[PDB]
Scaffold this active site. Structure first.
Site, PDB file in Angstrom:
ATOM      1  N   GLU A 133       0.827  -1.214   0.000  1.00 20.99           N
ATOM      2  CA  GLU A 133       0.000   0.000   0.000  1.00 20.99           C
ATOM      3  C   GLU A 133       0.861   1.264   0.000  1.00 20.99           C
ATOM      4  OE1 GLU A 133      -2.908  -0.087   3.072  1.00 20.99           O
ATOM      5  OE2 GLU A 133      -3.895  -1.804   2.239  1.00 20.99           O
ATOM      6  N   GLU A 249      -5.634  -7.965  -0.325  1.00 18.35           N
ATOM      7  CA  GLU A 249      -6.366  -7.871   0.933  1.00 18.35           C
ATOM      8  C   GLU A 249      -7.821  -7.541   0.590  1.00 18.35           C
ATOM      9  OE1 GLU A 249      -4.970  -4.731   3.468  1.00 18.35           O
ATOM     10  OE2 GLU A 249      -2.809  -5.433   3.466  1.00 18.35           O
TER      11      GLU A 249
END
Ligand code: NI
Ligand code: NI
Length: 309
Positions: A133, A249
């Site tokens: 991320e 995710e």
């Protein structure tokens, strides 16, 4: 052949709240050996292991990872591989990199030099994931610049190992289009999916401000259609760029009502399957968990929503 590798990610789960905390156990999870047997027997193909290497390095170049930390990660990886799970290790929660990427880019480079060297002789079903991320000051632009540099060095000691490249902007599905792909036949691009954010992160203390609780996700047609638009958007881009996709995710926090969580999770998971995306649920046993360490059993039917079959 990258596509064949993506297939051995298959059905996956993150072991979160563990090694990506400032130290292991601070956020509620210590990775027990038995978890890998539990996860494999449940039907998963793979595990993704977030790791905050940046908390266990020297300040001075070349930023030596602490040896005992490396041995701990080796133990975890080893137990997972001995359970015939595909394993993804990353770097995660490198806080300085988010604020000052220009300053800390070369630390990420050196972390990866060490990990890549340490694991070079490992089987092909251990994959590397450069960074979780990218966001904040690590902009799409700065990430497009940094990631090829890290990859270059991984490739020096690991010429053919799969490397996962996350989309920037917290790996939002939309951010896939802003990624500049290198010419490498052993990469997999990853996005994370938490839409609608007001549902999956309701009550989440770590988000500012905390979205209010009580939000529902009903599994109506337009809601399902929304997920399909986001995933079709990624698929269309991935097909055009000839690259596999890993949904690395996705999950809804346990402050969401269970019925909604089950429907959302099943829908997201079936959408990843529909478009040929591998996936890793967030996460195994903590605040979004599908496993209850106290009762020592899977949380059903949410676990089935993840695993299917
Ligand atoms: Ni430490
Ligand atoms: Ni050991």
């Amino acid at each position: 052949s990258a596509l064949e590798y993506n297939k051995i990610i298959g059905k996956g789960v993150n072991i979160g709240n563990a090694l990506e905390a400032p130290f292991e156990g601070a956020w509620g999870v210590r990775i027990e050996d038995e978890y890998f047997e539990i996860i494999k027997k449940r039907g998963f193909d793979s595990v993704r292991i977030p790791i905050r290497w940046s908390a266990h390095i020297s300040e001075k170049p070349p930023y030596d990872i602490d040896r005992n930390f490396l041995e701990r990660v080796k133990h975890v990886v080893d137990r997972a591989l001995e359970n015939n799970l595909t394993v993804i290790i990353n770097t995660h929660h490198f806080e300085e990199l988010y604020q000052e990427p220009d300053k800390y880019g070369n630390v990420l480079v050196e972390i990866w030099r060490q990990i890549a060297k340490f694991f070079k002789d490992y089987p092909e079903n251990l994959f590397f994931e450069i960074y979780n991320e990218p966001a904040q000051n690590l902009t799409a632009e700065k990430w497009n610049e940094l990631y090829p540099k890290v990859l270059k060095v991984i490739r020096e000691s690991n010429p053919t190992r799969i490397v996962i490249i996350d989309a920037p902007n917290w790996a939002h599905y939309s951010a896939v289009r802003s990624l500049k792909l290198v010419n490498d036949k052993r990469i997999i691009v990853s996005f994370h999916y938490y839409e609608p954010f007001n549902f999956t992160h309701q009550g989440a203390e770590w988000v500012n401000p905390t979205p209010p609780v009580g939000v529902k996700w009903n599994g109506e047609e337009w809601e399902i259609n929304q997920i399909r638009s986001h995933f079709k958007y990624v698929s269309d881009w991935a097909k055009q760029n000839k690259v596999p996709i890993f949904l690395g995710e996705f999950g809804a926090y346990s402050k969401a009502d269970m019925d909604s969580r089950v429907k959302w999770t099943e829908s997201v998971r079936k959408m990843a399957e529909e478009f040929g995306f591998s996936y890793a649920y967030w996460e195994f046993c903590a605040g979004f968990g599908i496993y209850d360490r106290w009762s020592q059993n899977w949380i059903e039917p949410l676990a089935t929503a993840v695993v299917g079959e």
